[PDB]
């Protein structure tokens, strides 16, 4: 330290240990059709 | 001192005039060892009769 993701040493530790439960597991999503451009379908 | 909890070590608003903010040892004991302010006085105790 509004998406918040662990960075720095704790994130490196999580990646190295492959923690089964990361502190802030996030999943970015991309849209194929008109929902990508139009805000209502998004 | 080995504890990685960074919360107790932090300088609190509650320490104003009570404990010196700047003065503290360096190393594993940062914040966990505090030296008294100039005007700070410790209550000695009294019977509440």
């Amino acid at each position: 330290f509004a998406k918040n993701v662990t960075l720095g040493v704790p994130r490196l530790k999580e990646l190295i240990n492959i923690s089964k439960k990361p502190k802030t597991p996030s999943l970015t999503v991309f849209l194929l059709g008109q929902s990508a451009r139009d805000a209502e379908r998004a | 001192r080995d504890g990685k909890l960074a919360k107790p070590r932090q300088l609190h608003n509650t320490l104003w005039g009570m404990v010196c903010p700047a003065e503290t040892p360096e190393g594993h004991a940062v914040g966990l060892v505090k030296n008294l302010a100039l005007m700070a006085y410790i209550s000695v105790g009294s019977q509440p009769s």
Partner: protein, 528 residues
């Protein structure tokens, strides 16, 4: 128990097999020495007298080693022990021992460490392999290790109570191996980030910046004095840039002699605006920024951390890649010596006058701070009467805090820009920042204009007391002063509440530095 003996740190395996205490190792305080070479390390006489390197007597060196034996252990350039063929060890410290001073080929004589010896130099928060490099011994008076300041960066050392280990290889095989693998010139460029690790840093960098400008002009005697500190100088004095009415050389002209061989490199000075490359004067550079080094000659530009520093494509990186480690070592040393000896002429400093702006600038900064306070008060009042709409994904408190933080950050950035715009070309803070030796623009902003918002755990100063930061403030006060925004600057001095809030802010950095190191070290050990 036996299991406790065979355990982790201080156990048998980790504490006596993977790592162990070694003979032939010395440690003392380090001290800067610009007059030493890059690969050279200053060694006190007592350490060299105690430290011994075993040498095998041959008909080539029988006379010199016999002389060293005759000197004994009293005089420094001597030997402490003699080892015969059968392995019996002879001590020259006790009594003259006249019958045993005879030397014949095949014996081992343990002479004291001398100049040119090969040693491993270590400072041991060893993160990467450059934290331990082989050095060349030069004996100096007094009692501290001395090493060149470009070598400072790989070791991460600073000359304040720092201590470094000195390991002396005891065999010819390991000595040659350290010479051909771990020497300081051989490790200028890292495999970690394919950049040079050593770079012209601090005093020599600032003086390079002040010496590379068009403004500098050097007379005859100053040119001679600078030229003799160039070790690779061919002995031909270059024709001065100005011949009439009087012969005046230029800083770039003399610096071009330092650049080895025929090095071609193009860089940009930190001051370089982005408008120059688009419009005219692209190759003329009215501010003399950008860098062009053609045929090993500095044609134009100002040198800074972007050119001589530790960065990809830097001038020193090009020197290492095109020429080689040996010549780049001399390039480093010549830069250091000649530039320090020119700063002996020009001089550098920092003072109170360097940390104050014009009265108009102070008035502008005060007006900006007042406007910021008015805007944040208006935002607080608007949130109070519920006109503040919540930004999606954020609660009303989150949006209010975001608005306040944006206002305060914009105010601080504007004040910093105004303060940096007010610095004269002679200002020493600006001279240090543009050179990249030390400091930054935010540092000048904090010194001159505004310290800025103080944050604890990434948020504005919390309510340690009951809905108030300090007893001096009213309850539920979200204003900039109450929540930790420091209006004053370091030059002006912080108010007591601002002083306490700044103490809280610095406590965060102190705790992070003290607490992250253990976990980082554990991560490094696991990876290794």
């Amino acid at each position: 128990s036996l299991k406790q003996r065979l355990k982790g740190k201080e156990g048998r395996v980790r504490g006596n097999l993977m790592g162990k205490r070694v003979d032939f190792s010395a440690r003392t305080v380090i001290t800067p020495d610009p007059n030493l070479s890059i690969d050279q390390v200053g060694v006190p006489r007592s350490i060299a007298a105690n430290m011994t390197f075993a040498e095998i007597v041959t008909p080539f060196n029988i006379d010199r080693l016999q002389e060293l034996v005759r000197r004994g252990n009293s005089q420094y350039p001597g030997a402490k022990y003699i080892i015969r063929d059968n392995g019996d060890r002879i001590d020259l410290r006790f009594h003259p021992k006249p019958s045993d001073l005879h030397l014949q080929t095949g014996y081992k004589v343990e002479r004291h460490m001398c100049d040119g010896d090969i040693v491993i130099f270590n400072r041991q928060p060893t993160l990467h392999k450059m934290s331990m490099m082989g050095h060349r011994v030069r004996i100096l008076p007094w009692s501290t290790f001395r090493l060149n300041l470009s070598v400072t960066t790989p070791y991460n050392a600073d000359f304040d109570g720092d201590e470094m280990n000195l390991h002396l290889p005891q065999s010819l095989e390991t000595r040659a191996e350290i010479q051909e693998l771990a020497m300081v010139p051989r490790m200028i460029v890292t495999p970690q980030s394919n950049r040079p690790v050593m770079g012209i840093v601090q005093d020599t960098l600032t003086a390079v910046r002040k010496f590379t400008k068009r403004d500098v002009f050097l007379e005859r005697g100053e040119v001679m004095n600078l030229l003799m500190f160039l070790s690779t100088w061919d002995g031909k004095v270059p024709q001065p840039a100005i011949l009439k009415p009087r012969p005046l050389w230029t800083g770039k002209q003399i610096f071009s002699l330092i650049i080895p061989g025929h090095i071609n490199c193009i860089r940009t000075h930190s001051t370089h605006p982005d408008d120059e490359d688009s419009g005219p004067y692209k190759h003329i550079s009215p501010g003399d920024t950008k860098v062009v080094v053609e045929n090993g000659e500095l044609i134009m530009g100002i040198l800074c951390k972007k050119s001589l520093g530790t960065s990809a494509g830097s001038l020193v990186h090009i020197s290492y890649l095109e020429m080689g480690h040996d010549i780049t070592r001399l390039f480093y040393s010549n830069i250091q010596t000649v530039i320090n000896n020119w700063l002996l002429i020009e001089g550098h400093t920092i003072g109170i006058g360097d940390s104050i702006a014009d009265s108009k600038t102070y008035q502008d900064i005060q007006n900006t701070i007042k406007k910021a306070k008015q805007d944040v008060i208006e935002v607080i009042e608007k949130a109070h009467n519920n006109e503040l709409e919540p930004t999606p994904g954020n609660t009303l408190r989150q949006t209010f805090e975001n608005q306040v933080n944006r206002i305060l950050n914009d105010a601080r950035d504007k004040t910093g820009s105004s303060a940096q715009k007010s610095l004269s070309e002679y200002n020493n803070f600006k001279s240090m920042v543009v050179s990249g030796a030390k400091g930054s623009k935010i540092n000048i902003s904090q010194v001159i204009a505004v310290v800025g918002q103080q944050n604890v755990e990434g948020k504005r100063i919390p309510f340690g007391f009951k809905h108030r930061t300090l007893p001096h403030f009213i309850k539920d006060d979200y204003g900039p002063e109450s929540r930790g925004f420091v209006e004053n600057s370091y030059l002006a001095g912080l108010t007591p509440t601002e002083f306490f809030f700044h103490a809280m802010g610095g406590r965060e950095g102190l705790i992070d530095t003290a607490v992250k190191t253990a976990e980082t070290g554990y991560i490094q050990r696991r990876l290794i």
